[PDB]
Amino acid sequence: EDKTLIKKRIDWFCKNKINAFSPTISPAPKSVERNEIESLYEGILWFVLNGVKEIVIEKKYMGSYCDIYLHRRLEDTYLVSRNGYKINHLDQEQCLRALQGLHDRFSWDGVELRIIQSELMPWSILGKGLI
Amino acid sequence: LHYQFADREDFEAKYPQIRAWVDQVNQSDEEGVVIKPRTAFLPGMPPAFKVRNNDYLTLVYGVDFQDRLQEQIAKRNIKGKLRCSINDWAINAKLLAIPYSELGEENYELKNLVLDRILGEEIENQLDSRL
Amino acid sequence: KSERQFAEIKPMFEAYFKEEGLDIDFQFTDTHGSRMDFIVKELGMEYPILDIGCGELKYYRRFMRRNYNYSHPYFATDTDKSVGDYAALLKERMEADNLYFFSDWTDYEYKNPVNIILTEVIEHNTPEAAEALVKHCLSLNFHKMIITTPNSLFNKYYHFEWTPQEFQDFIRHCVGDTSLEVTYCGIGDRINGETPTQAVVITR
Amino acid sequence: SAKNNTHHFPKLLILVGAPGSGKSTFARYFIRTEDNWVRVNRDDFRLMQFGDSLMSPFYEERITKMVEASVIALLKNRTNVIIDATNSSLRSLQDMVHTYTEYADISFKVFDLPVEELVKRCDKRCEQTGKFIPKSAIEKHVTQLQYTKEKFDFKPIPRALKETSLTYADQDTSLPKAVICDLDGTLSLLNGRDPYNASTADQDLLNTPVAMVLKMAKQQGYKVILLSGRENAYREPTERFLAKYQIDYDLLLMRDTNDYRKDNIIKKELFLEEIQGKYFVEFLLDDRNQVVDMWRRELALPCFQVNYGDF
Amino acid sequence: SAKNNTHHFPKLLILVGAPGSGKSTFARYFIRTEDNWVRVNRDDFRLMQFGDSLMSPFYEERITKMVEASVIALLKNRTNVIIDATNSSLRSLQDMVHTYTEYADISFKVFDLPVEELVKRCDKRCEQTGKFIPKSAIEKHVTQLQYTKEKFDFKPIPRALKETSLTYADQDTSLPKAVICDLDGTLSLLNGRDPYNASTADQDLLNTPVAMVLKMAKQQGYKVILLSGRENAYREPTERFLAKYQIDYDLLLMRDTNDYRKDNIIKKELFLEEIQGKYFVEFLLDDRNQVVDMWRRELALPCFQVNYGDF
Ligand SMILES: [Mg+2]
Ligand SMILES: [Mg+2]
């Protein structure tokens, strides 16, 4: 929280051309009734009573959250973490190769870059997260 | 999964199906399940609610988890994490709304938006670590 | 945690070593804190002080204890240019005040008497370079100077490190035939008459 | 030394740009990450008067006297100040540097971005709230900078203090030497008396050091002139006071009874009708702020202030 | 007479009330319908700093120096100020009357509203803007008033100039008589020289009138003591200047070379080590504000200010 560290962190957030930043995600409300501390039921219900009736349910995967700055020129693609951080400490080609499965899913007609929220596997290679 | 409910008692009816489905999300890969609204960003809404299966929770909370359940449940309080998850996403909307072209070391609206996010990281970091 | 918790336990420890040959006199404050007390006690508040190798200015923040009423300037040098920046960062006003930092000895022009603190600075550069510094200080208009270096005969309980003989020969070469009063004493826990840091009080 | 005595002073930062150029938005990030800084802002002063935008020429000059009184109060307190440039021109930009450079190292950041999407960020700042800024009013501003950008360097203006070379009025040295001394609050200490009711000045107290300048001034060629703002009605509680304290004097000049004009101008008028050109004043001894300015600034004489005025 | 020369002074209206009691809403109608009035408001100073409510002790302290700098600048200008009371707690409310009573006829309007109509417009307000005031912080305030309401009448309290009677320190009169004189800006007009680089001071100009005070005081028992904040390094362009003008003196005291502390505190230290107990000071002649404040306020000596300080 030292002013000079925040400042330079941000300076770098700006140079590295980062344009997004993850949220933390809350568990669903507990249900004492249903004897569970994060309740599937009470969670979707919460959305309902708040006027949201159209919802999705993905599977959360054991991995690190990363934002892929998927440049059309696949050489140019870099990664940023749950914080405002360029992911450089990885061999940019093994990374890029795994990233190419993805790359070929798009029409890149006048599209220079797609910013994509993703999980990296295993949680191992990047940070550790729970270890 | 994709669902639109319309009224809270439609929700009641399809719950047991939805409950049965996430019930199978149990393999070593999976933190559990996540619940998002169809629209990714809405006013005052959180991006998601996680609902972690008992096996994964056992890892965040420790091996005595089931034996200590009513305890932990009573201790559980998401009201603060939920607020940050909500504000956090609201920042991201604004960060994304900033044009990629304009990202740079003197976009002092971007610099503000970030400092904001950074501050809210220091806040959300003091919360119950197991959320 | 307290000095009267300590006072009650000290006899027990001393006795333990007495039947192991060793005549130990324990002190509560760490070795550094003993040093700081000795100097402050010895130098007092009456002349402005010159803190050579002042580092993080820990000696500065001691003389500015409100209790003491330091009614003088306070001169400081470190050749280490990271300290360089720190001092200049109290032209943030955080207190200039009476600080005067200098890294070039030709920028120190005060001609009235000072007291001089040279703590553990003479072994974070060479003995030839130590002589050069000490010899300079003894030329200056000073009242008391205190020089502090470890006593190597103590290192047996764990740049260069000097013995009491080695240190006393160093002071003699630097004072030469000038007319000073030179006094030695140990600082810190005293095992068989030997302490972990040794000191001089040179007086005009 | 001078090489080696260097002094440090608060910074004043001036934000020059047309509206929409990110003056505020920058300051918002600035005072949060740099350290000894308070922002002063004209608009926010308007809101105190419940004005949304530009108000009466009344409020407006008054709003200013508050703004500079604040920027200076902060600067004097060795606290750094950031402000939006006022008019964004040239000459008000000078008025600023004039007013404030005694007090701080002045520096500038210009926000010079184009007129057509200065409108595209002024027309997205003017619908969160209300407002409107015509692409006329914003247009006065973009070029007004462009001319003053052209004839003024926006690089630092280090604290310039400036001494007024003290030059006294030219007195005809042929005249006799004399010193002039005030009464109320200078030679005669009121001690709870009424300022305006000088009827009990016969029981005032004596400001000894001043008395001792007059008692010494006459032990030399000096003639001692007493010049009081006391109504002439009270002249014998006065030369009772004078006699009581061995304060001998040549000439007692006093306010016409029932005059009541402010005591600056009746003392100055007295000086010209009763003293000027007819005596030689070495120096004057007075006390009240208002009057000292008068002697010093208007008539350019040596005037020694004995205690505090500011009334 | 005196009964009929009467003077009038600006009004200060202080608005005493709980948050929600309609303090603002009154001022909005007041400064629009009454005539010579400007509002000062603390919250708005916060907004300048981009904080919505209650900030760092840092900002908050400074904001006060701004508020007071503003109320007074306005008051001095013969302009009426309406301001919200800082609290209801008697002593901050007293602190206000201290601060501003030299300057204006103070008056008060209390906004005494019952506790639950105060929440019912605090929770209709706190839907309006972002702010919030709980049903805790309102009531420390509502009852706080009902107590300080009881032990103070919100009576008008007309302008008070309190004349700190000029009382000098008590000196041993048997000691020798002496006058003390500053150099830079007092006996020596530095005239475009560097303030701090006094190496060329043998070509300064003579403040002729001060010289004629020293030249007169030495024509009596007075020892003439010069006490300059100039470095002793520059002592020989200095007694070059002095002899040049036959300004003979008994004792020249100067600043230790390489000292560099504020020039008041080295002069005070200079005064006590070298003058006190050994002399009787009739009066002193200095120039710089900081230093005259020292002499007068810290040491209670007669000090005659020769020209303008404020540097
Ligand atoms: Mg007067
Ligand atoms: Mg001066």
Author numbering:
A (entry chain E): 2 to 132
B (entry chain E): 264 to 394
C (entry chain F): 219 to 376, 390 to 435
D (entry chain D), E (entry chain A): 2 to 312
Quote the authors verbatim.
However, we were successful in performing structural study of a newly discovered bacterial RNA repair complex consisting of three proteins named Pnkp1, Rnl and Hen1, which form a heterohexamer in vitro. Since the newly found RNA repair system possesses elements of both T4 and Pnkp–Hen1 RNA repair systems, it can be regarded as a hybrid RNA repair system. Therefore, the Pnkp1–Rnl–Hen1 heterohexamer is likely the functional unit of a new bacterial RNA repair system in vivo. Because the Pnkp1–Rnl–Hen1 RNA heterohexamer possesses two identical copies of each enzymatic activity, a total of eight active sites are present in the complex, same as in the RNA repair complex of the Pnkp–Hen1 heterotetramer.
